[model samples]
Target: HHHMRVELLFESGKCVIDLNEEYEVVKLLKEKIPFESVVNTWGEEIYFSTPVNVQKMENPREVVEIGDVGYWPPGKALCLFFGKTPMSDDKIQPASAVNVIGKIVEGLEDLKKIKDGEKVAVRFASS
Candidate 1:
């Protein structure tokens, strides 16, 4: 995608992000931000902490796919759903309507190695 790209650094593996600037909240996370999640469920999803929350929905949606990077408002976290989460019913479920911030342009398959409580960092990629 022709968008702002980021490198998602995890404890185990690394993934890249292509940001969607339409969402203001993601603008807050474009730099080097630290994040981690203690819970792992739905085999296809991972939730991590974020610094701020979005006050209003911008380009929001409740459903996403393998490479979509989303902003979860309620948890004040960033979410990546690689497979079906707990709320799934043949499709990936969302905690709430999320700000469709960016897409994981590379290393999506490597996300399977990510573990619970893993630390994740977001930063702008020169590429």
Candidate 2:
């Protein structure tokens, strides 16, 4: 499926990522979605809630790459991984398997600078 790119604006910084157009989570995120949850930090990852209750499109993975975006079913939140979390030894690992949604295009390193309680917004890019 063709994926569309989108921007994640948080605090004063913004970056782009490719959203899988085929994913229901991404579709819902593009619509009546303006979610912001208090920052929850874990090692180098930050995440928040969205109540996007959806089943995994495929098998969830325990390991993911830096800048990988995922939907954590357990917490029902969108997750952003940019570095090794406490659960990883060689790669970024989630608390459990996660349904991946997209890829942070570049400049993912800058996300590490955001502080706790900051809000993040998602805006879909025009085709």
Candidate 3:
């Protein structure tokens, strides 16, 4: 008998920047304003809806203890997360807290001004 093998190519080396370390960028963006959500697509990739809201806040001492979803309805941004575990099922879980995921540095002006490991706040626009 012959078996078919499939190879999946996954992109690695993407860095995860902690929110706490990058507060300045995050604060500036969140301070701007918020708007309604809209959908957008570039080529084949479908981005969420737009008029994104920029949200900023301090990080919590503990990670969320359960699974939850967060959204910036205006920007069409969605964050699905699972909190830390090892608690009783009966324990009530709080809502998952999140800051906004702003535009990548390449898209924004003043790229030189942004420092390494700086917090980034995100906003969405309609197309």
Candidate 4:
């Protein structure tokens, strides 16, 4: 399958994300491309609200892998999981269950530098 890739733009820098093409949230996000949102952090995790608010998750998960992108239902947020969050003891956890939508493929270092209230944009990675 062709990679469903997207670029995340922060004031500090840009990172590339590999989306899970099989997820409905990924398709929803792709359609809302070039979206801008405010940055929100919980421990080492980054999450922010998006216009795509699909409450019915295709696959709901409480724990996620590093670099996993999650769509949070309650807040209508998209999460970037780079490491452990406050709710985690051993596994990386979100505040609640989220739909696993994608993974960050590059520039995690830059993502680490993002602070709260900073702006981020998600755009299609044109070839």
Q: Assess each prediction's global lDDT (C-alpha) against the native.
A: 0.73, 0.77, 0.29, 0.86
Off by over 4 Å in 3: 1-50, 58-62, 71-76, 82-127
Clash list (residue pairs), candidate 4: none
Task: Return the number of clashes found in candidate 1.
Answer: 2
Worst 10 residues of 2 by lDDT: 30-39
**Estimated TM-score for each candidate:** 0.84, 0.85, 0.20, 0.92
> What local lDDT score does residue 11 receive in model 3, on the 0 to 100 scale?
24
lDDT of 3 by residue, 1-127 (tens): 1211111111211112122225433334344434322222222111233233544444422233222223333343433233222322443232333443321222212322323333333333221
Question: What C-alpha lDDT does candidate 3 achieve relative to the native structure?
Answer: 0.29
Superposed by TM-score, candidate 3 places the C-alpha of residue 96 at a distance from the truth, in angstroms, of: 13
Comparing candidate 1 with candidate 4, which one achieves the higher TM-score? 4
Candidate 4 lDDT, tens digit per residue, 66-96?
9888889899998889889999689998889
Error of 4 at 98 (Å): 0.9
Local lDDT at 78 for model 3: 35
Instruction: RMSD for all candidates, in order, please.
Output: 2.5, 2.1, 17.2, 1.3
